[PDB]
Amino acid sequence: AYTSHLSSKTGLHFGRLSLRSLTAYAPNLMLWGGASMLGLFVFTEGWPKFQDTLYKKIPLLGPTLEDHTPPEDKPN
Amino acid sequence: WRTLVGVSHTNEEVRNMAEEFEYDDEPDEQGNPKKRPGKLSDYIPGPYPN
Secondary structure (H helix, E strand, O other): HHHHHOOOOOOOOOOOOHHHHHHHHHHHHHHHHHHHHHHHHOOOOOOHHHHHHHOOOOOOOOOOOOOOOOOOOOOO | OOOOOOOOOOOOHHHHHHHEEEEEEHHHHHHHHOOEEEOOOOOOOOOOOO
C-alpha cells in the first residue's frame, strides 16, 4: 500500500568522521601502516641493532650484511 | 698507530711497533713524571722534540 512516513536512522558520527567512512578507509589504513613500516625498515638498514634484531633473518639476504673480516685487521 | 691495522700490518704487528716507543704517561702518585710503552691510540712520534 501507500507509504505516508519515511522511517530512518541517523547513524554514528562525530563531525566529519563517520563509522561508514572509516570502515571504507580501514583496509587501506592497514595498508598505509604496512607501507610506513616498510619505509622505516628502509630507513634503519645501516643501523646495527635492527640489523641484528630483524634484518638478518631473511633467508637469501641473511649473510649479506654481516662482516667476514678476521679480528686481526681491526684495531678495536 | 691504529690506522695501520688492516691496511698494511696486522694488529700484533702494529702493537709491537708501537710498544717499541715511549710516550708521556700520567704522573704517578707522588707527582713525578712517568713514561709509557705506546699503544694503538697514540700517534707516530717524530724524531725531534721541537
